[PDB]
Amino acid sequence: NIDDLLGDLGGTARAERAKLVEWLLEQGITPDEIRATNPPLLLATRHLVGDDGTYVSAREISENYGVDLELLQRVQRAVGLARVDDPDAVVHMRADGEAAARAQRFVELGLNPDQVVLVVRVLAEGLSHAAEAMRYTALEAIMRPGATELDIAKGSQALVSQIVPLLGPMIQDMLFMQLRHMM
Amino acid sequence: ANIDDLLGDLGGTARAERAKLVEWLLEQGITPDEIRATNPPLLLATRHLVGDDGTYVSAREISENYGVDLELLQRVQRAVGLARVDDPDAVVHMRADGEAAARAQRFVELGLNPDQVVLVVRVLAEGLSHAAEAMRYTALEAIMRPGATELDIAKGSQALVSQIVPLLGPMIQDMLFMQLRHMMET
Numbered sequence: 001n002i003d004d005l006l007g008d009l010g011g012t013a014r015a016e017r018a019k020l021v022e023w024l025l026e027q028g029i030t031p032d033e034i035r036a037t038n039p040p041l042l043l044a045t046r047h048l049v050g051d052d053g054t055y056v057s058a059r060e061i062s063e064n065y066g067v068d069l070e071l072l073q074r075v076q077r078a079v080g081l082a083r084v085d086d087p088d089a090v091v092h093m094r095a096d097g098e099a100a101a102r103a104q105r106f107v108e109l110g111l112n113p114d115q116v117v118l119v120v121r122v123l124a125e126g127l128s129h130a131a132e133a134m135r136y137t138a139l140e141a142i143m144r145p146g147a148t149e150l151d152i153a154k155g156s157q158a159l160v161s162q163i164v165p166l167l168g169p170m171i172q173d174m175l176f177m178q179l180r181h182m183m
Numbered sequence: 184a185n186i187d188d189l190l191g192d193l194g195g196t197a198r199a200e201r202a203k204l205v206e207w208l209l210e211q212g213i214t215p216d217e218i219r220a221t222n223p224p225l226l227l228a229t230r231h232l233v234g235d236d237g238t239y240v241s242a243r244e245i246s247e248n249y250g251v252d253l254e255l256l257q258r259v260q261r262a263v264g265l266a267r268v269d270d271p272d273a274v275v276h277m278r279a280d281g282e283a284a285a286r287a288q289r290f291v292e293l294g295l296n297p298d299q300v301v302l303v304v305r306v307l308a309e310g311l312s313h314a315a316e317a318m319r320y321t322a323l324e325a326i327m328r329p330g331a332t333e334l335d336i337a338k339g340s341q342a343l344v345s346q347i348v349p350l351l352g353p354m355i356q357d358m359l360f361m362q363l364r365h366m367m368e369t
């Protein structure tokens with residue numbers, strides 16, 4: 001039964017949530033994932049940006065990718081998306097752990113760890129602004145008059161599915177373009 | 184003595200080191216023109232590693248080769264901080280910059296607002312210019328060692344930056360998707 005996924009909701013909101021929850025289950029999402037995510041609207045879109053629901057600790061990342069734990073935690077701080085600053089706290093999205101684990105390779109090439117950590121810090125800040133600009137841009141395109149939660153979920157998955165393949169190549173090209181025009 | 188007009192107003196140790204640097208840059212295919220235009224010319228031989236092959240195109244060439252509409256192309260070039268604003272047949276655009284800017288169109292084709300699309304470029308470019316600054320200082324710090332000649336630095340930056348480039352692209356992509364995941368869950 002869905003009802004506990006629906007909770008306190010009533011009226012039109014509960015009816016729209018029912019049809020959304022129904023579509024997500026067919027999408028292969030669990031009751032378990034829907035409870036932990038409010039609103040459940042973006043569950044069939046987050047996997048397109050690499051959130052599969054898996055979480056890891058800094059120590060797991062360290063051992064699994066063979067990187068220095070302390071350096072890793074500096075990078076996690078510099079990105080600044082999860083707090084719990086405990087090496088055994090399982091609070092990092094898998095893809096975030098793996099991304100943070102790349103930083104050490106720059107260090108092994110002789111780059112200064114302080115400076116690497118600083119770059120990550122400035123990049124994260126610049127990208128967090130672009131992210132928010134990106135969010136608004138996408139919403140404008142998805143959000144149409146009188147749309148239900150399910151309409152929005154379907155429209156978001158379609159649009160983000162088409163955008164994601166382009167975003168990676170683009171950001172990469174934009175970085176190298178800035179690096180071509182240093183001085 | 185053609186090299187002489189490429190040393191500028193330098194003197195002493197620094198003039199003779201600039202001479203050795205210039206002789207090597209020329210061996211790399213950097214033209215006297217490229218050297219004169221770029222001052223200090225120290226990382227002219229690292230430039231190709233970040234996508235500058237010294238080939239240039241016009242906006243018309245960009246619009247036709249890469250598929251983009253010429254009006255959008257100009258807007259994106261403004262947002263990025265490049266050639267203030269030119270003539271369609273003027274061959275003043277780095278080829279890789281034209282490819283980069285032309286990707287704007289595909290986003291518009293998916294039904295994204297052209298104004299918002301240009302806005303995102305503007306905001307992204309702002310963030311990345313700062314990142315690029317700090318990246319340069321990082322790389323420079325790693326190669327600079329006392330007793331380093333200008334040529335030593337040039338060659339050391341080639342060796343080092345050549346190893347860094349393949350890591351950078353995936354790096355920045357991951358750092359974008361990391362922000363998108365955080366914003367989505369937030």
Ligand SMILES: CCCCCCCC/C=C/CCCCCCCC(=O)O
Pocket residue numbers: 075099100102103106111115116119120179180181182226227228229230231233317318319321322344347351354
């Ligand atoms: C987790 C992210 C770690 C960030 C690591 C820091 C990045 C290293 C910096 C890149 C150095 C390459 C810069 C090359 C300058 C090119 C200038 C030119 O000659 O045109």
Ligand SMILES: CCCCCCCC/C=C\CCCCCCCC(=O)O
Pocket residue numbers: 042045134135137138139156160163170259286287288290295300301303304363367
């Ligand atoms: C001039 C060309 C610049 C192109 C910039 C790309 C524009 C990207 C627009 C949005 C893509 C971001 C996708 C994630 C947005 C959040 C979606 C959601 O949570 O509903």
Ligand SMILES: [Cl-]
Pocket residue numbers: 222223
């Ligand atoms: Cl000089």
